[PDB]
Design a protein around this nucleic acid. Structure first.
Length: 211
RNA sequence: GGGGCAAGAAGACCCUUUUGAGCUUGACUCCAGCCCGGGCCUGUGGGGCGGGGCGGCCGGCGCAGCGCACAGGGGAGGCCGC
C-alpha cells in the first residue's frame, strides 16, 4: 500500500507455538514476514547478514549435482556432483530432471550438463523458487555458494523458515533493537511495504499460521 | 401691373452622396431590468437511507491423503493426550 504503511515492525516474534517455552527445536525463530514477489532483488532487498554468521537456515538436503571439475573439493560427499549424467535422456526428454528432490537450497546446474540445460535444467531447475550459482567447467564451484545459504534474500520468504530474532528474547530484540536483520529494507523500495496480513510467519517445527 | 425667366430662399419635389436624424421590427451586434440554478454569507441539532473508515465473526476435497493438506505450507519437535 505505502512504504511506511507497516509502521508497526515485526515487534514480538516470540509468539508462535511458544507453549511451555520452546516452539521449535529450541527458542530458535522461524517467524518472519513473507513477500509479494513483485521483485526478486530490488523491492524485497537481498540482505547483508541477518545476524552474526548463522546456519544455512532450513538446513536443505546435501545433493547438489553441478560439476566435478577437481574431484577433491567434494568427491566422497557427492555434493560436488550427483551422477544424473548417465541419465543423458534429460535434454531430449526431462523425465527425471527434478524428480529426485527440489529440497536442496540450490539445484546447481553447471556447463558439464549444459547439453541438457534449457528450462527443465535451466532457470526453474528446482520448481521451488531459489537461486543457484555454478562457477565453470574450467574452475571449481563448491567453495563459493555465498548468496543463497546462511544472508538469505527476502524473495525466499514464502517457502523457507526465518530467524528474525529468536523466541528467547523477552519482548523485541529485532527491528530498531537489532539492525543486522532490519536495515537495508527501510521500505520495500518502489513497492508499498505492506504485503500479506500482519506477518506471513512461515514457521518450521510450528504452525505456519498466515496472520 | 405686360415684361425685366423683378427680388425671396445654397428647392424640403426627383436623383446622387460609401451624409444624417426621428421611428419600427421577427435587421445585424448588443446592454440595463427580471427570472432561474450552483457557491459564499451561515449556526446548532435529530434522523431516514445507502455508502463509508474502523470493526468482530467465520473460511479452506485433484487431495493421490496418516486425514475437505484450499493455496503458503513446513519441521521431525514437543506439550492434543504426536
Amino acid at each position: 500500500i505505502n512504504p511506511e504503511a507497516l509502521n508497526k515492525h515485526i515487534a514480538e516474534i516470540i509468539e508462535r507455538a511458544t507453549n511451555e517455552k520452546p516452539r521449535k527445536f529450541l527458542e530458535t525463530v522461524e517467524l518472519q514476514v513473507g513477500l509479494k514477489g513483485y521483485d526478486p532483488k530490488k523491492d524485497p532487498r537481498f540482505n547483508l547478514p541477518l545476524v552474526l554468521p548463522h546456519i544455512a537456515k532450513q538446513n536443505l538436503k546435501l545433493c547438489v549435482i553441478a560439476d566435478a571439475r577437481d574431484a577433491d573439493r567434494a568427491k566422497k560427499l557427492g555434493l560436488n556432483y550427483v551422477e544424473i549424467e548417465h541419465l543423458q535422456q534429460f535434454n531430449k526428454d526431462a523425465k527425471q530432471i527434478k524428480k529426485f528432490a527440489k529440497s536442496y537450497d540450490v539445484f546447481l546446474a553447471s556447463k558439464s550438463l549444459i547439453r541438457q540445460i534449457t528450462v527443465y535444467a535451466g532457470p526453474g531447475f528446482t520448481k521451488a523458487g531459489r537461486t543457484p550459482l555454478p562457477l565453470a567447467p574450467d574452475e571449481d564451484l563448491e567453495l563459493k555458494v555465498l548468496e543463497c545459504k546462511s544472508k538469505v534474500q527476502f524473495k525466499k520468504a514464502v517457502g523457507l523458515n526465518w530467524p528474525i530474532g529468536n523466541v528467547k528474547m523477552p519482548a523485541s530484540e529485532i527491528a530498531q533493537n537489532i539492525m543486522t536483520t532490519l536495515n537495508f529494507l527501510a521500505t520495500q523500495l518502489k513497492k508499498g511495504w505492506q504485503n500479506i496480513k500482519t506477518v506471513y510467519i512461515k514457521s518450521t517445527m510450528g504452525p505456519s499460521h498466515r496472520i
